Nucleic acid binder design. Sequence first.
RNA 1: AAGAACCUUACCUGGUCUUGACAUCCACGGAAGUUUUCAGAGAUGAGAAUGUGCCUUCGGGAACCGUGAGACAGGUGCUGC
RNA 2: CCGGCCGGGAACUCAAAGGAGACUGCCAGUGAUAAACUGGAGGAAGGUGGGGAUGACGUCAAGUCAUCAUGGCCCUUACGACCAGGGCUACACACGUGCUACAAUGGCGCAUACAAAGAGAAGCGACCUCGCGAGAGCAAGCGGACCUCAUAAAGUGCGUCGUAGUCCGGAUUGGAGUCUGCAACUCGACUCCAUGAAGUCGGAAUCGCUAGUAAUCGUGGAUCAGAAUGCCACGGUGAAUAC
Lengths: 127, 98, 151, 101, 79, 114, 206
Amino acid sequence: NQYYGTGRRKSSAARVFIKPGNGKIVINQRSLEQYFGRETARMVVRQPLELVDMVEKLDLYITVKGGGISGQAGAIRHGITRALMEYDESLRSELRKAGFVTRDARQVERKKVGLRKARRRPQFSKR
Amino acid sequence: RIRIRLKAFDHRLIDQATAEIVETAKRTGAQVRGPIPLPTRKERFTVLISPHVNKDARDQYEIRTHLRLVDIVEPTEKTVDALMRLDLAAGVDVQISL
Amino acid sequence: PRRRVIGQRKILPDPKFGSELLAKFVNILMVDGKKSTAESIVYSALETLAQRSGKSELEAFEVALENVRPTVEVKSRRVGGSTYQVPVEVRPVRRNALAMRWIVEAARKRGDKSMALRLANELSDAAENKGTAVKKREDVHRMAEANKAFA
Amino acid sequence: AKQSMKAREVKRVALADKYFAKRAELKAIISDVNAASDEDRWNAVLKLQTLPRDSSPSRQRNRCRQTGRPHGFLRKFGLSRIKVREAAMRGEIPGLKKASW
Amino acid sequence: RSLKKGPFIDLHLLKKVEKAVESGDKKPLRTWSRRSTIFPNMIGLTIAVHNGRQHVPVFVTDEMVGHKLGEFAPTRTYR
Amino acid sequence: ARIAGINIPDHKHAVIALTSIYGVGKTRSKAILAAAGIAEDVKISELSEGQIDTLRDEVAKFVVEGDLRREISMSIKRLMDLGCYRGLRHRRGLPVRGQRTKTNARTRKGPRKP
Amino acid sequence: GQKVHPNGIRLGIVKPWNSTWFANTKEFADNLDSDFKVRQYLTKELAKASVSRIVIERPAKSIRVTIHTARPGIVIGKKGEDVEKLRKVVADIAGVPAQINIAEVRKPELDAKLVADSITSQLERRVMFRRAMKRAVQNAMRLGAKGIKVEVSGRLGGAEIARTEWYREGRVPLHTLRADIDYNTSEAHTTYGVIGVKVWIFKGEI
RNA sequence: AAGAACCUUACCUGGUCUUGACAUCCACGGAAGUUUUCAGAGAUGAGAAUGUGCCUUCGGGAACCGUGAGACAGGUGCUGC
RNA sequence: CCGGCCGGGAACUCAAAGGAGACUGCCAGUGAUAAACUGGAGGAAGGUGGGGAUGACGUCAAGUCAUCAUGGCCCUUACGACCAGGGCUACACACGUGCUACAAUGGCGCAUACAAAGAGAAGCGACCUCGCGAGAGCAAGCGGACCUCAUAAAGUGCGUCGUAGUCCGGAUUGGAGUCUGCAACUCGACUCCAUGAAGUCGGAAUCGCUAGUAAUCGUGGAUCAGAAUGCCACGGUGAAUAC
Ligand SMILES: [Mg+2]
Ligand SMILES: [Mg+2]
Ligand SMILES: [Mg+2]
Ligand SMILES: [Mg+2]
Ligand SMILES: [Mg+2]
Ligand SMILES: [Mg+2]
Ligand SMILES: [Mg+2]
Ligand SMILES: [Mg+2]
Ligand SMILES: [Mg+2]
Ligand SMILES: [Mg+2]
Ligand SMILES: [Mg+2]
Ligand SMILES: [Mg+2]
Ligand SMILES: [Mg+2]
């Protein structure tokens, strides 16, 4: 049928529908080649497809909004790892012993008052 | 048809404002679309805590404002008049829409 | 830290040809957080090296890194008062990274034209080890050996 | 904060209420691009000074209603930061708890 | 560089200048309206602009027309 | 490469090479090059003479080089003659647009030495 | 001063607000000001009636004042005519109308405002601050309270220097947010100047 | 100081006010207000027309406005040792 | 008319409530069979998960009597009051904190991608028109997850620039303007045109920072008629190192 997965690296919240079929990776109409397939980390969306082969096994209907380039991409990776539940834990044995499934929160720290940008102390002066 | 929208400050005060504005309507004339959450408006303030000098030290306050939709997709007569002179729940402002 | 026996972070392997070692190199080139431009320069520099040397990249960036790579270095370790230099073997993990740092630091000077050009050239001179970075390695060695009386 | 200053302030407020937001038409209307661009508009920028130096809202310093402090003001509350905190901690201002996100 | 529609003048100074020129030349005019521009019809009158504690007379000439009065009344003396 | 008062550059795109003329910056240079029909990508060395004159007739319309110079000399001097506040600042070698004089103003006030 | 205000830090959790009225972003400020008005006035009048607190709720464009006090009889007076008078003069500045509701408290020695104003009223009458402070603590703890600490500060006794002295009994955890702690400061004007008498009362674990 | 062109403003120069810009008390006269004019930097000074309400002890009212007399008012004046 | 634009759907995102979850709880080993510790498992999260709030007895007779309250003292035809104009913006100089730089991981031109948080009615002001531009005119919608401020910028593609004080830098000044406001001279912001300074990475010295932190990139708010490189806040990209 069709299997869903969420994932949401840094702010951005991807949604990864996945099905068996053609090797094309569609995302918000834009091809994976043209959404960010030319820039660096073009394959971080294709990472959870190494130990669990893709090639032509499954087509991906991915959607994403919010965050930025790499953040969106991370969200997509996570969303795929969550979407790969059709063969359950047997995939997660190697899928987890390689990261991927970890939510990896680490959001931006709020700016602290009196400071300048969360950690940067506004220049001490002895005298 | 009845676009009721009610907002407040204390969240768990409007919980029973909505539960009660929906009960005293949904039971006597039925129909409801439930308490639609809506985003909470959060105004923040960053006042200086010291009467003089000491810019570094500040308190930051906020005023959470919780909105709630009601919606009643039919102008039920036992309900449309159960809104007027049957509202109450002070501390919570409620604007009915036609 | 005073107590924290924390481990090393795990970086992502290079997006192009798999090489975590030089992805580590790219990181030590990323000015103002722009990993993109930096990595573009890395690549450009490695294509103009795969041509002028005939070697690939994982082997071209190899037979060049070993020539700028330190074996023993100094760092003062005073015992009971006097603070004289004490030569000690550099950990392998820090080893190569330190070598890459010297390479890039050299690429910040020796102003050819384009940054990619400069870095590529740097690796080129590291090939027959006559560049500025290999000189850095040499002097780091002079700090030891000639001052290796301390042990 | 100097009773004099408070007075000055309230006289400015009210006297400003008397004229403008009512007789702001002298410049908001007569001062426009049309046929009134002739001597009428000039008569306007003339008459605009017949009014007292105040009346204009750009002379309401807008102080605290309690202490009358000219600085550290919050248009949301109308109170000085010192007084808004001093009241907030007493549970005066509704829904004003300490933010901590 | 300001006020795109019509020059600015204070009424007591505008009318003072009108009545002055229409009556003929006399003596410097004590005005405080440094904010006011200088009309062409003001050429000749040596009105005295207030500086903050005195009044400096200035014989308005053919060039001192576009400038305002405050341009010709230096206040903060320096050494 | 000799139009107007001077302009003698080389191996530069027509626009930047016309910016070399005192009295005309970039935008005005584009105006010129559109008024001459010449593309703004070609270098003066590539630019034929028959076009050089057409540029000349166009740059003559705008006040440039020495004429502009004595226009500025006329302005600043006239200001110093009137004795207005701006000219008054001109004579004392201090900022005119009302800049902080207390600390900076090191361009107008001159180099820091005494 | 470096400690947070006990009441503010709990306004959301255990403690409630004194003012209870949602307002639009416009008439919020002005309304708040009228509030401050009716509060300062009402307090300046019913001061002899030993008022602990007032709750200014505002339903349906009509203001409603509540007065938690230890002496509801003095507040109302005979037949409750004082109630009426107050409804008049107070409703006037609040925008009108103003139904008021007095609220009795049979445990006055446990309200921080009441204890504070008590110690204060003793302090104006030349009585020794130690006898008053310790008296208050004593009566509080034996009346039924898990904790209480009082604190006086100023010229106290007519000294040339100011010295703060606090006396406590029981458990009073200011950091435990689930803890219900009463708190009130009250200036005590004397012949030698103002003497602050701030008091904490740990009423309960929750 | 989370924002000095005027105001803010506490400073300076000049022109001014004095129970006073802000509060209550008493006597006395006037609905309040609004339109507009002249002198002046303006403050203020001098007017000119209009309107002349809510309770009748109706020698008074509840506000509002002006002079009178003394209480006082007012101070971002000094001392955070 | 491919705009979730329309039916319709409540799955999914997000929204806001109510709950669940992590406790060294389980496992090994160590340790006085104690607390505890090192490791493993599972787990979204691992041992105070991240961050914030919360500041003990006191110390500094720290700071504020100019926010406010108040004891003294002092003025009280004045040190109180009103108004106009000036000043708080002066400048041989000295320091603190910032911003923009010195360039090619860069400037410039064209094309194009991806945010969160907000704010808003004597306010936000689409659309359309004219203006090189700031803006002006006309005038919807919106007290709002719907309407607006509002195109995020770095980035990415392509073209040019060749290491010169230069197509770097953008100060300074001239001219012409727009906007708010009674009024922009003293002393506003912004736009256009021209001008085009120092500066080639900084002596002695010194500061910040262990992660989504530093660095760099833009956005919004409060104050506010107008007036930020400041303050507060949001998101993008995103390290190095810790023996
Ligand atoms: Mg006072
Ligand atoms: Mg203002
Ligand atoms: Mg001023
Ligand atoms: Mg005087
Ligand atoms: Mg002290
Ligand atoms: Mg001291
Ligand atoms: Mg001091
Ligand atoms: Mg003044
Ligand atoms: Mg200053
Ligand atoms: Mg440029
Ligand atoms: Mg130079
Ligand atoms: Mg740390
Ligand atoms: Mg290490």
